[PDB]
Curated annotation (Swiss-Prot), chains A, B:
Predominant location category: cytoplasm
Gene name linked to the record: kasA
Protein name: 3-oxoacyl-[acyl-carrier-protein] synthase 1
Source organism superkingdom: Bacteria
UniProt-listed Enzyme Commission number(s): 2.3.1.293
PANTHER family xrefs: 3-OXOACYL-[ACYL-CARRIER-PROTEIN] SYNTHASE, MITOCHONDRIAL, POLYKETIDE SYNTHASE-RELATED
GO cellular component terms given for this protein: cytosol
Stated role: Part of the mycobacterial fatty acid elongation system FAS-II, which is involved in mycolic acid biosynthesis. Catalyzes the elongation of long chain acyl-ACP substrates by the addition of two carbons from malonyl-ACP to an acyl acceptor. Involved in the initial extension of the mycolate chain and forms monounsaturated fatty acids that averaged 40 carbons in length.
Length: 415, 415
């Protein structure tokens, strides 16, 4: 018989702490209550690079509390933005967990990102062109390497059982956590800090995503633009985030008297082999990922009460994911799509949405999916909307999919 | 009794085909032959950006046969460099394995890289600065995304059991092979194309790496510059490469009639939590990676006949690595350092060197480490040199270490 969490095959792994910075708040708890009050982080873009380039997208969600307003002249010179965000959340998370003294030989870190420290690439490039090789920072390399944030967090908190950085574009935050759960259940570690980081909204990233027609242009109502599964959706809205969580065996937590917020039960990772940016319309492979997170957890489709959807709010994207949920036998679960209020944080998004899945299992509630005003016939899912819905949610799947056809599903439980 | 490969805990995994392009040959069997004949792939840099930027480093090993000389006008505009390298090697490896017909849903891809399609970032940046947002191509995100090369190979070959990209700098290509094994013995896959690809020697990469002052500046004698474990080493040499290997269950391979070139038995991934770019002096966490690989393969250190050494030819790296080999208790092993001849390929190197470890095992011979002319006392390793060294090699560890504090060790065995 194949091992699973349920049959004692895998060690029990629990979530003991979470941390996030959102367009709604620097505090995950304030964001949670903000989401439950039906609030949106999406505002009008006020950065002068908007009119300057007369961008077709003029809305989005900046962090409520700027990362760099916590960052010294040394950090600003020595780190890239993701590395700085990494330090912040990495710092904030450890205190939240009581600042545990762990055996770092049993302590890993896994944090994904969309690109890494890309501002440092263009800077180093501008400088070399104007003043040559000597103008390049001796720290250019470590600031640019996309494993930069993870390495910073590993060094910062002291992890010596591996610092890993999975990249799969928009599912990097989920895959980050899925690999942290593997390192643990395979005997490589006892505890791990995991999640995803990502950079702030800028001109170049808007242009690149706009030129694919992937982004909403409902500029005149910033808070109505992001409409996952709504019949009138027209693409995603940028919504800056960063998120981390602490996971450890249920016995490691027990020992240090740590109260688990939820359980991480299993992880599924598949691929489409279909298109470089378009999701496979049939949802089969994405649905296989959900199934696979279930098999490792020892749960059946019927067991799943909630589904935190990727829900980017694009026509083919939300439609492909509706099919995915039906292949997985999970179309009778209560569905929520956080991007309705928090936008798309690319590499961070999956990890932020994983913390929301955990807060749903802890608190027994699902926030309303914003802007869900016209059910799309093709979708046909139980989209929680209008009000927060309460129930004894016991099992949930967090979904995330990236460009390259990456499908990451995480099985969660209530502690 | 925890699972090992020897005790039955894990499925048996075999390497059934390999492919590599280097500074010596576009052909892995001809690179091997020249490496044994005592060939260097390093030469004088004749690119005009060399004089233009007056760079302190004017030596490196360009690819014997340029990737773009095999790429049409279509591929040249729809892919970044590393995507185009991966397409070439993916298709080269596939045929070398016989163009197998495998279950797509049990077929995975894990390829590591240093940063991704970075040339496309600076191109899109120049384009926008010069003609605005609509001068960014709709294909830029898929060309830039760090997972791009792996996605391209997964689309190309049809990998629907996961397409992953681990990034850990210089160990990226080793860690990818690590994660494919994991992926198979965890039962998410039965066959996996895996390794690393990397971009070419270019002006801005040289500038950035020599600003850290860790590059050899021995431009008068390109072939004698990369001197790992030599007392008179002065930093690393760029040597271009990309490489892939095909792994599968011994059962999957027997059922299609593939001849295993070696076995993949285990892997260990740890981290130093010491410095952002420098390895830990004591080599402890690094040795621990090696140790972890043996614990999983079911081997004692006394069984390891040969260590394929990261051996970057920097003072502190070689010094730290020798200590890790003693921590691992593998100091009686025959040590080869391939960078002495083929140079450093960053994201691709650990994969290239994993392929070499397989040819050592298969052909029961080790090539000479070039330039090893003065034994450095502190080092104290049995380094192969002068002439290749034949012998009865049954097991071997391949070491890869990366900026950010990463240590990857892979345990291989003769089939
Ligand atoms: Na989600
Ligand atoms: Na090596």
């Amino acid at each position: 018989s194949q091992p699973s969490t349920a049959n004692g095959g895998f060690p029990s792994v629990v979530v003991t702490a979470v941390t996030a910075t959102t367009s709604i708040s620097p505090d995950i708890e304030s964001t949670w209550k903000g989401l439950l009050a039906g609030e949106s982080g999406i505002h009008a873009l006020e950065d002068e690079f908007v009119t300057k380039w007369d961008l077709a997208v003029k809305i989005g969600g900046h962090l409520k509390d700027p990362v760099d307003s916590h960052m010294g002249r040394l950090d600003m010179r020595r780190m890239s933005y993701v590395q700085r965000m990494g330090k912040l959340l990495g710092g904030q998370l450890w205190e939240s967990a009581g600042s545990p003294e762990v055996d770092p030989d049993r302590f890993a870190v896994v944090v994904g990102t969309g690109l890494g420290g890309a501002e440092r690439i263009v800077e180093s490039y501008d400088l070399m062109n104007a003043g040559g090789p000597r103008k390049v920072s001796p720290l250019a390399v470590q600031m640019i390497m996309p494993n930069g944030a993870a390495a910073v967090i590993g060094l910062q908190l002291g992890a010596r059982a591996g610092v890993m950085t999975p990249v799969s574009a928009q599912s990097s935050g989920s895959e980050a956590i899925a690999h942290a759960w593997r390192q643990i259940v395979m005997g490589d570690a006892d505890v791990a800090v995991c999640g995803g980081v990502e950079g702030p909204i800028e001109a170049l990233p808007i242009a690149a995503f706009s030129m694919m027609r992937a982004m909403s242009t409902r500029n005149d109502e910033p808070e109505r633009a992001s409409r996952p599964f709504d019949k009138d959706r027209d693409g995603f809205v940028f919504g800056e985030a960063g998120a981390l969580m602490l996971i450890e065996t249920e016995e490691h937590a027990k020992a240090r008297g740590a109260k688990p917020l939820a359980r991480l039960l299993g992880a599924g990772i598949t691929s489409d082999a279909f298109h470089m940016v378009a999701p496979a319309a049939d949802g089969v492979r994405a649905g296989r990922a959900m199934t696979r997170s279930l098999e490792l957890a020892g749960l059946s489709p019927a067991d799943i009460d909630h589904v935190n959807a990727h829900g980017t709010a694009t026509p083919i994207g939300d439609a492909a994911e509706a099919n995915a949920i039906r292949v997985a036998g999970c179309d009778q679960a209560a569905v929520y799509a956080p991007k309705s209020a928090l936008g798309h944080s690319i590499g961070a998004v999956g990890a932020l949405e994983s913390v929301l899945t955990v807060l749903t299992l802890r608190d027994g509630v699902i926030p309303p999916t914003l802007n869900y005003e016209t059910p799309d016939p093709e979708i046909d899912l139980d989209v929680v909307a209008g009000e927060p819905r309460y129930g004894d949610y016991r099992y949930a799947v967090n979904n995330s999919f990236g460009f390259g056809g990456h499908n990451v599903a995480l099985a969660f439980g209530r502690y």
